[PDB]
Design a protein around this ligand. Structure first.
Ligand SMILES: Cc1nc2ccccc2nc1OCc1nc(-c2ccccc2)cn1C
Ligand SMILES: [Mg+2]
Ligand SMILES: [Zn+2]
Length: 313
């Protein structure tokens, strides 16, 4: 109870910034996550013995895949932390508890394949969940780990609060299905511009949290250029393995997933930044002004991809 987690000085300072990289030392990621829950939520949000056992069961249920791994989980949660610390007063105590856990859990037991490849492979998970296939699976793995004995971090919630927190996490995890992102931002855009956006409408809050989940999930595009560039190698390593697996089923994969089209990567990032990243962080800054550094960093990395195309790197 009087046992505060601390970090070394450089991390203690850099962790509050949006562009923080959690570093290559795996064994420090749990302490980083616990640090962020204590400062974001409070030291009294979770029984510490339960939290630690939950974190390590979550870690064990991430796979050793090049991108959708334990390190992605902690990164996406760090971004959420930054958003919540920079917009302290706009969020309920249940939202702060739910959303960091949502982020740590959002890709549980990912195999490094898209929803699309699961359906063309005819994976059993595609029979059980017709849309947002992986994302329903991820929420389902979260509930599983919450029901292991000694793992219910939400033990001290009421019957009803428990149900609200599991509902926040469910919607939050579903929202990481990028197919749902496009509609969700268009609606937030129109609601903010017409002046109808209202943060007491629970269905409006839902959309906002959905946008934050996209922002945290894409936060690779808001890092120092060498972090952004090296993360892209891991992202394409999954895409090209999925591309290979499409070819094994006798299907020409889209060029994004075709390793014979490495050459077009810089233009593919340009497309992604203009179609998804910029619009995501633009709409997010409008609704939550202190998130501006995510937009400014995204615009910087776009300019870095333009430089790659021009043969200046
Ligand atoms: C989906 C996607 N998700 C991301 C999540 C985080 C960070 C970067 C991301 N980039 C992405 O996509 C990148 C892309 N490459 C191509 C492409 C590449 C080579 C040849 C032809 C096309 C197209 N598109 C959209
Ligand atoms: Mg996912
Ligand atoms: Zn993710």
């Amino acid at each position: 109870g009087l046992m505060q987690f601390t970090l070394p000085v450089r991390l203690c300072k850099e962790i509050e910034l949006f562009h923080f990289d959690i570093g290559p030392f795996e064994n420090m990621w749990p302490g980083i996550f616990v640090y962020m829950v204590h400062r974001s939520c409070g030291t009294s949000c979770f029984e510490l013995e339960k939290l630690c056992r939950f974190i390590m069961s979550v870690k064990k249920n991430y796979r050793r895949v090049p991108y959708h791994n334990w390190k992605h989980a902690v990164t996406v949660a760090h971004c959420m932390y930054a958003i919540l610390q920079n917009n302290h007063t706009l969020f309920t105590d249940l939202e702060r508890k739910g959303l960091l856990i949502a982020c740590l859990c959002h890709d549980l037991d990912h195999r490094g394949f898209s929803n699309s490849y699961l359906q063309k492979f005819d994976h059993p998970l595609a029979a059980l969940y017709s849309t947002s296939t992986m994302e329903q699976h991820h929420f389902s793995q979260t509930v599983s780990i919450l029901q292991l004995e000694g793992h219910n971090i939400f033990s001290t919630l009421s019957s009803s609060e428990y149900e609200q927190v599991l509902e926040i996490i469910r919607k939050a995890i579903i929202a990481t299905d990028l197919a749902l992102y496009f509609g969700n931002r268009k609606q937030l855009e129109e609601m903010y511009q017409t002046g109808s956006l209202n943060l007491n409408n629970q269905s409006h809050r839902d959309r906002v949290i959905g946008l934050m989940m996209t922002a945290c999930d894409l936060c690779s595009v808001t890092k120092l250029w060498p972090v952004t560039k090296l993360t892209a190698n891991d992202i394409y390593a999954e895409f090209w393995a999925e591309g290979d697996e499409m070819k094994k089923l006798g299907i020409q994969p889209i060029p994004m997933m075709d390793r014979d089209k490495k050459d077009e990567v810089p233009q593919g990032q340009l497309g992604f930044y203009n179609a998804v990243a910029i619009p995501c962080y633009t709409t997010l800054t409008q609704i939550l002004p202190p998130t501006e550094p995510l937009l400014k960093a995204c615009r910087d990395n776009l300019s870095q991809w333009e430089k790659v195309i021009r043969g200046e790197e």
